[PDB]
Amino acid sequence: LEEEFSYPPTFQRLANQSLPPSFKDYHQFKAYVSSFKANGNIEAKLGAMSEKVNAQIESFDPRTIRELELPEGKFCTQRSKFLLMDAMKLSVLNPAHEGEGIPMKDAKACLDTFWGWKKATIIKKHEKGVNTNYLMIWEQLLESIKEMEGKFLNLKKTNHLKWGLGEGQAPEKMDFEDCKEVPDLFQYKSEPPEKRKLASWIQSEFNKASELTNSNWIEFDELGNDVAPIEHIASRRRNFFTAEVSQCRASEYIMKAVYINTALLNSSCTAMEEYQVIPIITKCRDTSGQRRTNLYGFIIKGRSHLRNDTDVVNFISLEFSLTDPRNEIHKWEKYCVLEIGDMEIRTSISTIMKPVYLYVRTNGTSKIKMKWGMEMRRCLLQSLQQVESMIEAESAVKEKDMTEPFFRNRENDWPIGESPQGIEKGTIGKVCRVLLAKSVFNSIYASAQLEGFSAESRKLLLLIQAFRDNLDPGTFDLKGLYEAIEECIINDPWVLLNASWFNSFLKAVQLSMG
């Protein structure tokens, strides 16, 4: 009975070269370790080391510190996959449920509610694009819808459509031997993104996402019957949550996202070579109870041989709107806006005549981005469990279910915005819809910039909280922390607004204190 394990000569020689510098042999170093005994080694070297190696505590006062620097540049453009506040719906009254009926049949039904179309004209060019291709694509689509007979619609690969969907734009792949000597063979552009300046529209968009609407946008599937008393309590509270969230504008964006990304992913997978039309549909229930089918526009899917999870599908989005693009032209850099008709609109006691625009743009997405768009309903969970924890925290202290007081009274309110008058407070329902909008916009505008800004600025927020808790906070390299934050504020509209929100918050804290 024995056991053996030894180094052959090759490894023995590697063993000898993987030691601290002062040792010539592995057997030697193994003996130094087996016999070592500490005799003030750390204290000695600590006396020897330069006293420039230190961590000086600089105390942290949020009255001392500055606002984050936001970048300068051209203004940030819209970059969502679909229109938000600027969207316009053609709709029909329809008993159909939250996903029933043939999409293109529904779409044609919605079109057939609107007359007063026009010969289309370009009213705002996509400066970097061949705008008459956008014009011809709309007309091609409109006539192909007219002439379709089936469940799905595949457009012919015309020149104007091939262009808008980037057909053939991939450089042809060669072996390096065959192209070694080309002069302008360079490595792909790999600069950091160009900076951009904060613009009005993203704050406006968020205000509208936080509002209530007249329609229930989200239908919920069934639960098992309630039995436990806590389940009855839960369903009571879930009633308040459901209406507050289903009727919020951000939930409409959720359902637009879930529909578009679901339709794109499925068509991307099954119709890889077809230019397939996808109508932008939502179903909703009015507060009056009427069920309704809405049509926002159309999407033309390009080829979709998606292999890697980042691979791109090019698509064209053709979306109705009453918004005049010229009033905010920096918002629409990527779009070519057409004027396609005129609409008679009811008011209180007068009919108004407004022109109908078509926001057109080329765009792209990926399997990973589509996957996360299909899952955007989890935004509901982010807001609601924060709300429910607030209701539950008081319920613990008050020792009663504070659900009904919070939603029906207004004795409890929280700061959630600023007007010229100053800091405005809101009810728990408003808080719910603001946090829902925040979570929905994190999903619409996901970006590495947001990831970096959120994680690093969380540290600065916690430092501010420590001071306000009277816990005597201290930093080591506060300047480096600001750099880690500001490094992430490059060009994204949503991150720029969050950076601004932090400054507004910092400023509001400084006032109430000193």
């Binding site: 509002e211 209530l212 308040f240 209406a243 507050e244 009727q247 507060t287 939603f407 329902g429 408003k430």
Partner: peptide
């Protein structure tokens, strides 16, 4: 419950 806003 019918939510409302000012």
């Amino acid at each position: 419950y019918s939510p409302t806003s000012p």
